[PDB]
Write a protein that binds this DNA or RNA. Structure first.
Length: 41
RNA sequence: GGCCAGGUAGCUCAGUCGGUAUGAGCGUCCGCCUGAAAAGCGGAAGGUCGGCGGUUCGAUCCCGCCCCUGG
């Protein structure tokens, strides 16, 4: 699960959803899913 | 003077001498529910753990000065 290849796939969907965040409210949700305490990272 | 105890979520406070503060109660949001609510049940959001530095792959947790609280 640690695999740096699978690790890179996590930062991919993060920055992708971050770049696809159009509003500040969507970002706060995106930050929760990709940077919060329950995020895969 | 030099040593102590404290600073932690919106409020009142626990807790940790390195990888989750599974933080609590209340406060906020969603669902079931109701004409609409609340409780109840179920699901979530939110803290840069007092500031600035030092070490470490990584410090609320280990080192130094200071901000301010009763000692």
């Amino acid at each position: 699960m640690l695999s740096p290849e699978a690790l890179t796939t996590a930062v991919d969907a993060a920055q992708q959803a971050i770049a696809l965040a159009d509003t500040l409210d969507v970002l706060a949700r995106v930050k929760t899913e990709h940077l919060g305490d329950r995020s895969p990272l």
